Amino acid sequence: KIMRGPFMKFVAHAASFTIFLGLLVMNAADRFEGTKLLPNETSTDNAKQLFRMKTSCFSWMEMLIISWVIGMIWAECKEIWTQGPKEYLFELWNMLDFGMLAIFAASFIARFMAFWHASKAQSIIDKVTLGDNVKYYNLARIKWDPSDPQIISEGLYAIAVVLSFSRIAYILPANESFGPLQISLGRTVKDIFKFMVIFIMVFVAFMIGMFNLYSYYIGAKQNEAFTTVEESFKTLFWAIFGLSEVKSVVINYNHKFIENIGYVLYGVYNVTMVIVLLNMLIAMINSSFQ
Amino acid sequence: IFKFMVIFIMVFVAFMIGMFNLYSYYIGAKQNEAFTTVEESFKTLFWAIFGLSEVKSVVINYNHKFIENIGYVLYGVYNVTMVIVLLNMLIAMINSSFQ
Ligand SMILES: CCCCCCCCCCCCCCCCCC(=O)O[C@@H](COC(=O)CCCCCCC)COP(=O)(O)OCCN
Ligand SMILES: CCCCCCCCCCCCCCCCCC(=O)O[C@@H](COC(=O)CCCCCCC)COP(=O)(O)OCCN
Ligand SMILES: CC(C)CCC[C@@H](C)[C@H]1CC[C@H]2[C@@H]3CC=C4C[C@@H](OC(=O)CCC(=O)O)CC[C@]4(C)[C@H]3CC[C@]12C
Ligand SMILES: CC(C)CCC[C@@H](C)[C@H]1CC[C@H]2[C@@H]3CC=C4C[C@@H](OC(=O)CCC(=O)O)CC[C@]4(C)[C@H]3CC[C@]12C
Ligand SMILES: CC(C)CCC[C@@H](C)[C@H]1CC[C@H]2[C@@H]3CC=C4C[C@@H](OC(=O)CCC(=O)O)CC[C@]4(C)[C@H]3CC[C@]12C
Ligand SMILES: CCCCCCCCCC(=O)O[C@@H](C)COP(=O)(O)OCC[N+](C)(C)C
Ligand SMILES: N#Cc1ccc(O[C@@H]2c3ccccc3C[C@H]2N2CCC[C@@H](N)C2)cc1
Incomplete structure (x- = not known):
């Protein structure tokens, strides 16, 4: 009768999230x-098994995480067919919580299919040379394929571990000192979502304009910036935080016309982003005394 | 700021464990020694608040560009989130001085 009260129910539901975060920490x-x-x-640890056997086998702590994610998917489907599939998508945090479980499920599916391929190939080879069906296995990380499911699972598990820490937003507004901080932190993301539109207009403008300038100098440049669309994207993204050098506009030839155009366009980009961010900061300072 | 350091260390611990879990198996096959030990993943995310951590700390030497693109996206989201948290702290402390 004590554990059916609302506060002990809240304490139990927060303790079962503390346990999940402790499992995510102590797994690695x-x-x-x-x-x-x-x-x-290459480490086999049994002198008769492949190397890809003791990499994809589930530990005793990687099964409890699977049980938590299975219960967390079931407790979301029960919410879907009780509040209805139209009033459930009305809150965007439910979508942010559903994406984390989808990413966890994809990670565990990829790890299971990697273990399944490893067992199907290890059933054949129950020192010497191996045939061309077991030869891909018993190989170190340098020789794996770039689309191996073992590196799809390890890539999605990191995003899932990052996103699962955002469930503190469900237990944080019960406190008298971190509830208003969550309210005032949520009201300043809705104030920058409207400035990110002009931000990405200026970003897309300078990205396409400098990609069109430095496209023909792909091998004749000081580094690999502004030559591919992803390189011109990341060179202008990391320049907001000052992590992009000025040696990324220098070419090795004697065409100083194009180099001076690149210098001027990069300087105008930096000045324009400083103006846009300062205007955003002043507007958000002003829309807090109202 | 003692009340904003709590949300600061929540976001910090989140991205620290999430990127340590990504770059753990590439301890000798990486451009430098970031994100491989827990103290290295701690200091690479601490010195990135002051801009003293390069973008070459997410690059691996292999052809696994999946994991490298995951690291690029996680590092960019970390920087944007810390900028949002510090700007919210500055605006809240400006507002709690005219009261
Ligand atoms: C939302 C508002 C945005 C306003 C944006 C205005 C901000 C203007 C920033 C200026 C950017 C300068 C970047 C400096 C890096 C290197 C510049 C450089 O190499 O100089 C050019 C200078 O070329 C120009 O004509 C600069 C004109 C820039 C005007 C920009 C106005 C939008 C080369 O010419 P020179 O080498 O002087 O000539 C040979 C003489 N020995
Ligand atoms: C508190 C609020 C926080 C909000 C956080 C939102 C901030 C979003 C920041 C974006 C971070 C981007 C970092 C840029 C560095 C390099 C990106 C990169 O390498 O691109 C990825 C792009 O991959 C993606 O899908 C990016 C999606 C990011 C979405 C983040 C939303 C949270 C690789 O894909 P690709 O090379 O284009 O594909 C091959 C085509 N030739
Ligand atoms: C293993 C590593 C990654 C750290 C894991 C994080 C947790 C140990 C921390 C982070 C957030 C904390 C919570 C933040 C808010 C609250 C509300 C608090 O309740 C009240 O303030 C009064 C209740 C009321 O009167 O309504 C009880 C503790 C609790 C659940 C905290 C419990 C411990 C938590 C889960
Ligand atoms: C917004 C409206 C008003 C139009 C924008 C103003 C333009 C008239 C200005 C701004 C940028 C200027 C350019 C910036 C840099 C260069 C490179 C420069 O080339 C060299 O320095 C030669 C190098 C060598 O061979 O030694 C010649 C001028 C030029 C084209 C400038 C020409 C005049 C521009 C287009
Ligand atoms: C908060 C909720 C809404 C969920 C979060 C949104 C996700 C659906 C997005 C955000 C981050 C994205 C990822 C960021 C980077 C990558 C790497 C990319 O891999 C490559 O670029 C291949 C490289 C090569 O081999 O050439 C494939 C897509 C992927 C996994 C993206 C998949 C979709 C993700 C998970
Ligand atoms: C990916 C980064 C991981 C970092 C983890 C830090 C967790 C802090 C959560 C937080 O401050 O939430 C902010 C966005 C306000 O949310 P809301 O708009 O008030 O919505 C709350 C609605 N609710 C149903 C969750 C209570
Ligand atoms: N009786 C009761 C009860 C139990 C739990 C509850 O909230 C759950 C909770 C509790 C602690 C820590 C994290 C989360 C996530 C919340 N979860 C609920 C269903 C939909 C899902 N998208 C989100 C609300 C009411």
């Missing part, structure tokens, strides 16, 4: 100071 606890399994090395 053998590698806190170095993994001791090099990307070029």
Whole structure:
């Protein structure tokens, strides 16, 4: 009768999230100071099994995480067929919570199919050379394919681990000192979503304009900026935080016309972004005394 | 600012564990020694508040560009989130001085 009260129910639901975060921390606890399994090395630990056997096998802590995610998917489907699939998408945090579970499910599916391929190939080979169906396995991380499911799972698990820390927003407005901070932090994301439109207009403008300038100098440039659309995207994205050098507008030829055009366009980009961010800061300072 | 450091260390611990889990298996096959130990992933995200952490700390030497693009996206989202949190702190402290 105590555990059916609302406050003990809240305490139990917060404790079962503290446990999940503790599992996510202590899962990678053998590698806190170095993994001791090099990307070029090979460790079998049984002298009769493949290397790709003791990499995709599930531990005793990677099954509890699967049980938590299965219960967390079931507790979301029960919310879907009780509030209705139209009033459930009305809050965007439900979509932010559904994407995390979808990414966790995709990660565990990819790891399971990697383990399934490893077991299907290890059933054949139950020292010497191996045939061309087991030869891809028992190989270190340097020789894997770029689309191996073992590196799809390890890539999606990181996004899932980052996104699962955002469920503190469900237990944080019950407090008298971090509730108003969450309210005042949420009201300043809706104030920058309207300035990101002009931000991406100026961004797309200078991205296409400098890609059109430095496209023909792909091998004759000081580095690899402004030559591909993704390179021109990241060179202008990391210049907001000052992490893009001025050596990214220099070419190796004697065409100083194009280099001076690039210098002028990069300077105008930096000045324009400073003006836009200062206008955003002043507008958000002004829309808090209202 | 003692009350905003709590949300600051929530976002910090989130991205620290999330990027340590990504770049853990590439300890010798990476451009530098970031995001491989917990102290390296801690200091790479601490010194990125002051802009003293380069973008070459998310680059691996292999042809696994999936994991490298995940690291690029996570580092960019970390920088944008910290800019939002610090700007919200500055605006809140400007507002709680005319009261
Ligand atoms: C939302 C409002 C946006 C307003 C944007 C205005 C901000 C203007 C920023 C100026 C950017 C300068 C960048 C400096 C880097 C290097 C410049 C450089 O190499 O100089 C050019 C200078 O060329 C120009 O004509 C600069 C004109 C810039 C006008 C920009 C106005 C939008 C080369 O000419 P020179 O080498 O002096 O000539 C040979 C003499 N020995
Ligand atoms: C508190 C609020 C926080 C809001 C956070 C939102 C801020 C979003 C920042 C964007 C970060 C981008 C970093 C840029 C660095 C390099 C990006 C890169 O390498 O591109 C990825 C782009 O991949 C994506 O899908 C980007 C999606 C990012 C969405 C983030 C939303 C949270 C690779 O794909 P690709 O090379 O275009 O594909 C091959 C085509 N030739
Ligand atoms: C393992 C590492 C990654 C750290 C894991 C994080 C947790 C240990 C922390 C972070 C957020 C904390 C919570 C933030 C807010 C609250 C509300 C608080 O309740 C009240 O303020 C009064 C209740 C009322 O009167 O309504 C009880 C503690 C609790 C759940 C905290 C419990 C401990 C939490 C889960
Ligand atoms: C918004 C409206 C008013 C139009 C924009 C103003 C233009 C009339 C200005 C702004 C940028 C200027 C350009 C910036 C840089 C260059 C490179 C410069 O080339 C060299 O420095 C020669 C190098 C060498 O061979 O030694 C010649 C002038 C030029 C084209 C400038 C020409 C005049 C421009 C187009
Ligand atoms: C908050 C909720 C709404 C969920 C978050 C949104 C996701 C649906 C987005 C955000 C980050 C995106 C990822 C960022 C980077 C990558 C790497 C990219 O891989 C490559 O570029 C291939 C490289 C090569 O081999 O050439 C594939 C897409 C992917 C996984 C993206 C998949 C879709 C993601 C997970
Ligand atoms: C990806 C980064 C991970 C970092 C984790 C930090 C968690 C802090 C959450 C937080 O401050 O929420 C802000 C966005 C306000 O949300 P809202 O717009 O008030 O919406 C709250 C609605 N509710 C149903 C969740 C209560
Ligand atoms: N009786 C009761 C009860 C239990 C839980 C509850 O909120 C859940 C919760 C509690 C602590 C920490 C994180 C989360 C996530 C919240 N979850 C609920 C369903 C939809 C899903 N998108 C989000 C509300 C009411």
